[PDB]
């Protein structure tokens with residue numbers, strides 16, 4: 001079976017609105033979401049619908065852009081690095097599960113290149 | 127390389143008619159396939175530029191996709207149900223030709239084709 005999706009809102013966690021977190025939602029997540037290769041990464045991997053019975057035997061830290069969008073909206077992250085780690089986990093999971101050079105891996109590699117271009121333009125803390 | 131222009135979906139010089147088979151192809155066949163979990167790569171012409179497939183249109187000279195078939199049905203472009211069925215078959219076979227047995231995209235096309243064949247076996251009598 002599929003696991004429940006990652007936690008996205010926690011009222012017990014402290015919250016802060018910052019220019020780096022705003023950039024991650026308004027620029028980074030927005031740009032990646034609209035990319036031509038984003039669709040398979042917009043929601044948690046549905047291992048049942050996709051016939052991947054070993055997906056959650058191999059990937060114990062699933063991550064997807066729909067979860068990242070919700071985390072940003074709900075002030076789940078205190079630091080930009082926590083959000084950046086979730087984007088990195090999403091790409092790494094794809095590289096671990098799939099064979100190198102597969103179409104899905106080339107999609108993730110292109111999204112990662114675009115992500116890293118946008119993270120180089122992360123504004124300095126105000 | 128550029129993409130070719132998409133297949134024509136409307137031609138005001140062609141005659142038009144409504145048939146129970148053409149209605150069934152839009153209402154039942156195309157609608158059922160469109161909602162399938164693996165339909166999304168087949169819902170628009172193959173954009174070889176955005177998808178980074180430089181040899182696609184060197185191999186596939188009769189491109190076809192469900193977005194085009196849907197528009198053809200909505201524009202009364204088809205006179206015979208056979209023309210619509212041929213377009214679905216062209217779409218699947220193009221996928222089998224460009225890709226290789228066992229590729230994820232081919233398994234997606236095979237699942238759609240199985241459903242298509244089930245729905246076409248119940249095509250109403252003219």
Ligand SMILES: COc1nnc2ccc(N3CCC(c4ccc(OCCN5CCN(C)C(=O)[C@H]5C)cc4)CC3)nn12
Nearest residue numbers: 040041045050052094097103104167168221224230231
């Ligand atoms: C008619 O289209 C058409 N004709 N020739 C072609 C040639 C390639 C091609 N495409 C490019 C590849 C794409 C695609 C491939 C696999 C895939 O998922 C595999 C399962 N995933 C699920 C999601 N995550 C994040 C994963 O790590 C693993 C577990 C998803 C999309 C479908 C479109 N389309 N194409």
